[PDB]
């Protein structure tokens, strides 16, 4: 999958369905934020910025390595967001899931055993 217009427009068409959320109110996830995350995440894993993989192996691989760097780097709403987004991207993307909030998706992603909990 090399930036397939299908898997792309599709995964993104369903990914946006996710909610940004904050803690009490609601919100809709846009391509702008979804990009800053998926992009920042890919780069964090020594990979290209516009890395749009279409395999649980690639998505999970990034979420794993990224998580490791996040801890070693410490706490930060920035790194935290990029991570949560990565999980929702693989689910709402590869699985074309339409989770309500990014948090709900991430929780399920790991709840199933797709995101290692080191």
JSON list of C-alpha atoms in Angstrom, two decimals:
[
{"chain": "A", "resi": 1, "resn": "UNK", "atom": "CA", "xyz": [0.00, 0.00, 0.00]},
{"chain": "A", "resi": 2, "resn": "UNK", "atom": "CA", "xyz": [1.71, 3.14, -1.28]},
{"chain": "A", "resi": 3, "resn": "UNK", "atom": "CA", "xyz": [-0.57, 6.06, -0.44]},
{"chain": "A", "resi": 4, "resn": "UNK", "atom": "CA", "xyz": [-3.37, 4.22, -2.24]},
{"chain": "A", "resi": 5, "resn": "UNK", "atom": "CA", "xyz": [-6.04, 6.77, -3.15]},
{"chain": "A", "resi": 6, "resn": "UNK", "atom": "CA", "xyz": [-8.54, 4.13, -2.05]},
{"chain": "A", "resi": 7, "resn": "UNK", "atom": "CA", "xyz": [-7.18, 3.02, 1.33]},
{"chain": "A", "resi": 8, "resn": "UNK", "atom": "CA", "xyz": [-6.34, 6.69, 1.88]},
{"chain": "A", "resi": 9, "resn": "UNK", "atom": "CA", "xyz": [-9.58, 8.47, 0.99]},
{"chain": "A", "resi": 10, "resn": "UNK", "atom": "CA", "xyz": [-11.38, 5.54, 2.63]},
{"chain": "A", "resi": 11, "resn": "UNK", "atom": "CA", "xyz": [-9.45, 5.28, 5.90]},
{"chain": "A", "resi": 12, "resn": "UNK", "atom": "CA", "xyz": [-9.62, 9.06, 6.17]},
{"chain": "A", "resi": 13, "resn": "UNK", "atom": "CA", "xyz": [-13.31, 9.12, 5.26]},
{"chain": "A", "resi": 14, "resn": "UNK", "atom": "CA", "xyz": [-14.01, 6.93, 8.29]},
{"chain": "A", "resi": 15, "resn": "UNK", "atom": "CA", "xyz": [-11.20, 8.20, 10.51]},
{"chain": "A", "resi": 16, "resn": "UNK", "atom": "CA", "xyz": [-12.68, 11.70, 10.58]},
{"chain": "A", "resi": 17, "resn": "UNK", "atom": "CA", "xyz": [-15.76, 10.06, 12.09]},
{"chain": "A", "resi": 18, "resn": "UNK", "atom": "CA", "xyz": [-13.78, 9.96, 15.33]},
{"chain": "A", "resi": 19, "resn": "UNK", "atom": "CA", "xyz": [-14.25, 12.68, 17.95]},
{"chain": "A", "resi": 20, "resn": "UNK", "atom": "CA", "xyz": [-11.40, 14.89, 19.17]},
{"chain": "A", "resi": 21, "resn": "UNK", "atom": "CA", "xyz": [-12.80, 15.06, 22.69]},
{"chain": "A", "resi": 22, "resn": "UNK", "atom": "CA", "xyz": [-11.17, 16.92, 25.58]},
{"chain": "A", "resi": 23, "resn": "UNK", "atom": "CA", "xyz": [-12.61, 15.74, 28.88]},
{"chain": "A", "resi": 24, "resn": "UNK", "atom": "CA", "xyz": [-16.18, 16.99, 29.09]},
{"chain": "A", "resi": 25, "resn": "UNK", "atom": "CA", "xyz": [-17.32, 18.35, 25.74]},
{"chain": "A", "resi": 26, "resn": "UNK", "atom": "CA", "xyz": [-17.22, 16.88, 22.23]},
{"chain": "A", "resi": 27, "resn": "UNK", "atom": "CA", "xyz": [-15.54, 17.64, 18.91]},
{"chain": "A", "resi": 28, "resn": "UNK", "atom": "CA", "xyz": [-14.84, 16.33, 15.40]},
{"chain": "A", "resi": 29, "resn": "UNK", "atom": "CA", "xyz": [-11.41, 15.16, 14.25]},
{"chain": "A", "resi": 30, "resn": "UNK", "atom": "CA", "xyz": [-10.12, 16.94, 11.16]},
{"chain": "A", "resi": 31, "resn": "UNK", "atom": "CA", "xyz": [-7.51, 16.04, 8.55]},
{"chain": "A", "resi": 32, "resn": "UNK", "atom": "CA", "xyz": [-5.28, 18.76, 9.96]},
{"chain": "A", "resi": 33, "resn": "UNK", "atom": "CA", "xyz": [-4.89, 17.21, 13.41]},
{"chain": "A", "resi": 34, "resn": "UNK", "atom": "CA", "xyz": [-5.02, 13.63, 12.14]},
{"chain": "A", "resi": 35, "resn": "UNK", "atom": "CA", "xyz": [-2.11, 14.53, 9.87]},
{"chain": "A", "resi": 36, "resn": "UNK", "atom": "CA", "xyz": [0.03, 16.27, 12.49]},
{"chain": "A", "resi": 37, "resn": "UNK", "atom": "CA", "xyz": [-0.29, 13.09, 14.55]},
{"chain": "A", "resi": 38, "resn": "UNK", "atom": "CA", "xyz": [0.19, 10.33, 11.98]},
{"chain": "A", "resi": 39, "resn": "UNK", "atom": "CA", "xyz": [3.02, 12.43, 10.54]},
{"chain": "A", "resi": 40, "resn": "UNK", "atom": "CA", "xyz": [4.79, 13.28, 13.80]},
{"chain": "A", "resi": 41, "resn": "UNK", "atom": "CA", "xyz": [4.42, 9.63, 14.78]},
{"chain": "A", "resi": 42, "resn": "UNK", "atom": "CA", "xyz": [6.02, 8.27, 11.61]},
{"chain": "A", "resi": 43, "resn": "UNK", "atom": "CA", "xyz": [8.97, 10.65, 11.94]},
{"chain": "A", "resi": 44, "resn": "UNK", "atom": "CA", "xyz": [9.38, 9.66, 15.59]},
{"chain": "A", "resi": 45, "resn": "UNK", "atom": "CA", "xyz": [9.94, 6.10, 14.37]},
{"chain": "A", "resi": 46, "resn": "UNK", "atom": "CA", "xyz": [12.71, 7.14, 12.00]},
{"chain": "A", "resi": 47, "resn": "UNK", "atom": "CA", "xyz": [10.27, 6.93, 9.09]},
{"chain": "A", "resi": 48, "resn": "UNK", "atom": "CA", "xyz": [9.06, 9.30, 6.36]},
{"chain": "A", "resi": 49, "resn": "UNK", "atom": "CA", "xyz": [6.55, 12.01, 7.33]},
{"chain": "A", "resi": 50, "resn": "UNK", "atom": "CA", "xyz": [3.84, 11.02, 4.87]},
{"chain": "A", "resi": 51, "resn": "UNK", "atom": "CA", "xyz": [3.90, 7.37, 5.92]},
{"chain": "A", "resi": 52, "resn": "UNK", "atom": "CA", "xyz": [0.42, 5.99, 5.24]},
{"chain": "A", "resi": 53, "resn": "UNK", "atom": "CA", "xyz": [0.74, 2.23, 5.86]},
{"chain": "A", "resi": 54, "resn": "UNK", "atom": "CA", "xyz": [-2.16, -0.17, 5.32]},
{"chain": "A", "resi": 55, "resn": "UNK", "atom": "CA", "xyz": [-1.14, -3.13, 7.49]},
{"chain": "A", "resi": 56, "resn": "UNK", "atom": "CA", "xyz": [-1.71, -3.94, 11.16]},
{"chain": "A", "resi": 57, "resn": "UNK", "atom": "CA", "xyz": [1.98, -4.86, 11.24]},
{"chain": "A", "resi": 58, "resn": "UNK", "atom": "CA", "xyz": [3.06, -1.38, 10.14]},
{"chain": "A", "resi": 59, "resn": "UNK", "atom": "CA", "xyz": [0.50, 0.53, 12.20]},
{"chain": "A", "resi": 60, "resn": "UNK", "atom": "CA", "xyz": [1.13, -1.52, 15.34]},
{"chain": "A", "resi": 61, "resn": "UNK", "atom": "CA", "xyz": [4.89, -1.38, 14.77]},
{"chain": "A", "resi": 62, "resn": "UNK", "atom": "CA", "xyz": [4.79, 2.42, 14.91]},
{"chain": "A", "resi": 63, "resn": "UNK", "atom": "CA", "xyz": [2.46, 2.53, 17.91]},
{"chain": "A", "resi": 64, "resn": "UNK", "atom": "CA", "xyz": [4.85, 0.22, 19.75]},
{"chain": "A", "resi": 65, "resn": "UNK", "atom": "CA", "xyz": [8.15, 1.96, 19.01]},
{"chain": "A", "resi": 66, "resn": "UNK", "atom": "CA", "xyz": [6.48, 5.35, 19.42]},
{"chain": "A", "resi": 67, "resn": "UNK", "atom": "CA", "xyz": [5.12, 4.41, 22.85]},
{"chain": "A", "resi": 68, "resn": "UNK", "atom": "CA", "xyz": [8.61, 3.42, 23.98]},
{"chain": "A", "resi": 69, "resn": "UNK", "atom": "CA", "xyz": [10.06, 6.78, 22.96]},
{"chain": "A", "resi": 70, "resn": "UNK", "atom": "CA", "xyz": [7.14, 8.56, 24.63]},
{"chain": "A", "resi": 71, "resn": "UNK", "atom": "CA", "xyz": [7.95, 7.05, 28.03]},
{"chain": "A", "resi": 72, "resn": "UNK", "atom": "CA", "xyz": [11.69, 7.68, 27.73]},
{"chain": "A", "resi": 73, "resn": "UNK", "atom": "CA", "xyz": [10.78, 11.25, 26.78]},
{"chain": "A", "resi": 74, "resn": "UNK", "atom": "CA", "xyz": [8.31, 11.66, 29.62]},
{"chain": "A", "resi": 75, "resn": "UNK", "atom": "CA", "xyz": [4.75, 12.97, 29.84]},
{"chain": "A", "resi": 76, "resn": "UNK", "atom": "CA", "xyz": [3.42, 15.41, 27.25]},
{"chain": "A", "resi": 77, "resn": "UNK", "atom": "CA", "xyz": [0.00, 16.14, 25.75]},
{"chain": "A", "resi": 78, "resn": "UNK", "atom": "CA", "xyz": [1.83, 16.38, 22.42]},
{"chain": "A", "resi": 79, "resn": "UNK", "atom": "CA", "xyz": [3.34, 12.89, 22.31]},
{"chain": "A", "resi": 80, "resn": "UNK", "atom": "CA", "xyz": [0.24, 11.48, 24.02]},
{"chain": "A", "resi": 81, "resn": "UNK", "atom": "CA", "xyz": [-2.01, 12.82, 21.26]},
{"chain": "A", "resi": 82, "resn": "UNK", "atom": "CA", "xyz": [0.18, 11.49, 18.45]},
{"chain": "A", "resi": 83, "resn": "UNK", "atom": "CA", "xyz": [-0.04, 8.05, 20.07]},
{"chain": "A", "resi": 84, "resn": "UNK", "atom": "CA", "xyz": [-3.80, 7.98, 20.63]},
{"chain": "A", "resi": 85, "resn": "UNK", "atom": "CA", "xyz": [-4.24, 9.16, 17.05]},
{"chain": "A", "resi": 86, "resn": "UNK", "atom": "CA", "xyz": [-2.00, 6.41, 15.67]},
{"chain": "A", "resi": 87, "resn": "UNK", "atom": "CA", "xyz": [-4.16, 3.77, 17.35]},
{"chain": "A", "resi": 88, "resn": "UNK", "atom": "CA", "xyz": [-7.39, 5.33, 16.05]},
{"chain": "A", "resi": 89, "resn": "UNK", "atom": "CA", "xyz": [-5.82, 5.65, 12.60]},
{"chain": "A", "resi": 90, "resn": "UNK", "atom": "CA", "xyz": [-5.07, 1.93, 12.30]},
{"chain": "A", "resi": 91, "resn": "UNK", "atom": "CA", "xyz": [-8.47, 0.97, 13.69]},
{"chain": "A", "resi": 92, "resn": "UNK", "atom": "CA", "xyz": [-10.69, 3.58, 12.05]},
{"chain": "A", "resi": 93, "resn": "UNK", "atom": "CA", "xyz": [-8.48, 3.17, 9.00]},
{"chain": "A", "resi": 94, "resn": "UNK", "atom": "CA", "xyz": [-7.42, -0.44, 8.47]},
{"chain": "A", "resi": 95, "resn": "UNK", "atom": "CA", "xyz": [-10.54, -1.70, 10.25]},
{"chain": "A", "resi": 96, "resn": "UNK", "atom": "CA", "xyz": [-12.56, 1.19, 8.82]},
{"chain": "A", "resi": 97, "resn": "UNK", "atom": "CA", "xyz": [-14.07, 1.48, 12.30]},
{"chain": "A", "resi": 98, "resn": "UNK", "atom": "CA", "xyz": [-16.20, 4.49, 13.24]},
{"chain": "A", "resi": 99, "resn": "UNK", "atom": "CA", "xyz": [-15.41, 4.83, 16.94]},
{"chain": "A", "resi": 100, "resn": "UNK", "atom": "CA", "xyz": [-17.06, 7.70, 18.82]},
{"chain": "A", "resi": 101, "resn": "UNK", "atom": "CA", "xyz": [-13.94, 9.21, 20.38]},
{"chain": "A", "resi": 102, "resn": "UNK", "atom": "CA", "xyz": [-10.22, 8.74, 19.74]},
{"chain": "A", "resi": 103, "resn": "UNK", "atom": "CA", "xyz": [-9.86, 7.48, 23.31]},
{"chain": "A", "resi": 104, "resn": "UNK", "atom": "CA", "xyz": [-12.52, 4.80, 22.85]},
{"chain": "A", "resi": 105, "resn": "UNK", "atom": "CA", "xyz": [-10.76, 3.53, 19.73]},
{"chain": "A", "resi": 106, "resn": "UNK", "atom": "CA", "xyz": [-7.32, 3.39, 21.35]},
{"chain": "A", "resi": 107, "resn": "UNK", "atom": "CA", "xyz": [-8.75, 1.57, 24.37]},
{"chain": "A", "resi": 108, "resn": "UNK", "atom": "CA", "xyz": [-10.29, -1.10, 22.15]},
{"chain": "A", "resi": 109, "resn": "UNK", "atom": "CA", "xyz": [-7.18, -1.29, 19.98]},
{"chain": "A", "resi": 110, "resn": "UNK", "atom": "CA", "xyz": [-5.14, -2.39, 22.99]},
{"chain": "A", "resi": 111, "resn": "UNK", "atom": "CA", "xyz": [-8.04, -4.14, 24.72]},
{"chain": "A", "resi": 112, "resn": "UNK", "atom": "CA", "xyz": [-7.97, -6.65, 21.86]},
{"chain": "A", "resi": 113, "resn": "UNK", "atom": "CA", "xyz": [-4.21, -7.10, 22.04]},
{"chain": "A", "resi": 114, "resn": "UNK", "atom": "CA", "xyz": [-3.08, -4.92, 19.14]},
{"chain": "A", "resi": 115, "resn": "UNK", "atom": "CA", "xyz": [-1.17, -2.41, 21.28]},
{"chain": "A", "resi": 116, "resn": "UNK", "atom": "CA", "xyz": [1.47, -3.89, 23.59]},
{"chain": "A", "resi": 117, "resn": "UNK", "atom": "CA", "xyz": [1.44, -2.58, 27.16]},
{"chain": "A", "resi": 118, "resn": "UNK", "atom": "CA", "xyz": [5.14, -2.46, 28.15]}
]
